[PDB]
């Protein structure tokens, strides 16, 4: 069923979560990538990334306020993926597709990986 | 704009936030309505409700783990609105529209209020 649905709701929720992120409101984690720091909400990171879901469902790790990622991870690539988590928008460019696909494979973000391949398989 | 967008992303994020809520994963607040308890995430409540946004941006209130709502609030009405926050789906019925519109006006949920009126203005 009887339920009615508000089409822009899920996107409106995301818009607000990103405004809370930009204003540093109720952010509970710091992600460190090559000496650069990214403040986020653990639940948004879990909802998006299979890696972060594994990290925050771990009895010891769920308690950490700071998470250091693999040193190979480019901070720009991570920043472009953190923005996608919060906006549904991916700033995919020829200059960053390699760095962004490598960051999405690591974070277990299947849909980013999928399209990332398609753009290079068409570029070749 | 150059950005590409994944259409189901925002809804997929919401689907996962609701699965975390159902499994009681990283829930940080307890909402009390007429002796009944609702476990949620403060950021989702803020993203949806103008009342909860005011509560969790308040220097003293943001620190509370338990929030007691006005006694007039029906727990079923609140439960139906908490489900809408997490799913974008509203279980609107003739038997609950009065209790659900009164709960949406209090929580400052303009879009629920708007449609709630429309259904009664057409019922009269």
């Amino acid at each position: 069923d009887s339920c009615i649905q508000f089409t822009r709701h899920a996107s409106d929720v995301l818009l607000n979560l990103n405004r809370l992120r930009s204003r540093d409101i109720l952010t509970d984690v710091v992600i460190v990538v090559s000496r650069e720091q990214f403040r986020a909400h653990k639940t948004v990171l879990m909802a998006c990334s299979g890696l972060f879901y594994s990290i925050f469902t771990d009895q010891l790790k769920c308690n950490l306020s700071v998470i250091n990622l693999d040193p190979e991870i480019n901070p720009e690539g991570f920043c472009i993926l953190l923005d996608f988590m919060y906006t549904s928008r991916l700033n995919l460019r020829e200059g960053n597709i390699m760095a962004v696909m490598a960051t999405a494979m690591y974070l277990q973000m299947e849909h980013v990986v999928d399209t990332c391949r398609k753009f290079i398989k068409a570029s070749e | 704009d150059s950005c590409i967008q994944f259409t189901r992303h925002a809804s997929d994020v919401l689907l996962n936030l609701n699965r975390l809520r159902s499994r009681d994963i990283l829930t940080d607040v307890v909402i009390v309505v007429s002796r009944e308890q609702f476990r949620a995430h403060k950021t989702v409540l803020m993203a949806c409700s103008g009342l909860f946004y005011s509560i969790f941006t308040d220097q003293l209130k943001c620190n509370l783990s338990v929030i007691n709502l006005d006694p007039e609030i029906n727990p079923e009405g609140f439960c139906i609105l908490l489900d809408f926050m997490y799913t974008s789906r509203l279980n609107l019925r003739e038997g609950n529209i009065m209790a659900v519109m009164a709960t949406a006006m209090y929580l400052q949920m303009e879009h629920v209020v708007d449609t709630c009126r429309k259904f009664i203005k057409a019922s009269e």
């Binding site: 339920c3 009615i4 649905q5 508000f6 089409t7 822009r8 | 789906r89 879009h111 449609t115």
Partner: peptide, 5 residues
């Protein structure tokens, strides 16, 4: 917005 899902 509201629609039938």
């Amino acid at each position: 917005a509201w629609v039938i899902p």
